[PDB]
Amino acid sequence: AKKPFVQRVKNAASKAYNKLKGLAMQSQYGCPIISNMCEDHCRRKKMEGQCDLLDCVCS
């Protein structure tokens, strides 16, 4: 017989996306009474939450 020899069909590749960061247009200059300090600070961390009359809320 002397059968042949071959078995090279490996690769494994399915991963090239990782972030999970970014708002959805709503916490940007839309609050009633937000301070540039809170807006800038919250924007720097790209954290989105809710706009409070007392200040901005990052979530």
Curated annotation (Swiss-Prot):
Q: What is its biological role?
A: Dual-function toxin that acts both as an insecticidal and an antimicrobial peptide. May inhibit voltage-gated potassium channels (Kv). This amphipathic peptide causes significant antimicrobial activity against E.coli (MIC=7 uM) but does not show any activity against S.aureus even at high concentration. In vivo, causes paralysis or death to crickets.
Reply yes or no: does the keyword Disulfide bond apply: yes
Site feature (Important for antimicrobial activity, but not for insecticidal activity) residues? K15
What's this protein's family per the entry?
Belongs to the long chain scorpion toxin family. Class 2 subfamily.
Could you tell me where this protein is found in the cell?
Secreted
Included stretch of the parent chain: 22 to 80 of 80
Q: Which residues form the BetaSPN-type CS-alpha/beta domain?
A: 28-59
Positions bearing the site annotation: Important for insecticidal activity, but not for antimicrobial activity: L53, L54
- Give the GO terms filed under biological process for this record: defense response to bacterium
Outcome (variant: K15A):
Important decrease in antibacterial activity against E.coli. No change in insecticidal activity against crickets
List the Gene Ontology MF annotations in alphabetical order. toxin activity
GO CC terms, sorted: extracellular region
Annotated site location: Important for both antimicrobial and insecticidal activities = K21
Disulfide-bonded cysteine pairs: these are C31-C51, C38-C56, C42-C58
Keyword Cell membrane found = no
Free-text domain note: Contains 2 domains: a N-terminal domain that is unstructured or forms an alpha-helix in presence of membranes and a CS-alpha/beta C-terminal domain, which consists of an alpha-helix disulfide-linked to antiparallel beta-sheets.
Q: Which domain of life is it from?
A: Eukaryota
Q: What is this protein called?
A: Peptide LaIT2
What tissues harbor this protein? Expressed by the venom gland.
Keyword list, A-Z = Antibiotic, Antimicrobial, Disulfide bond, Neurotoxin, Secreted, Signal, Toxin
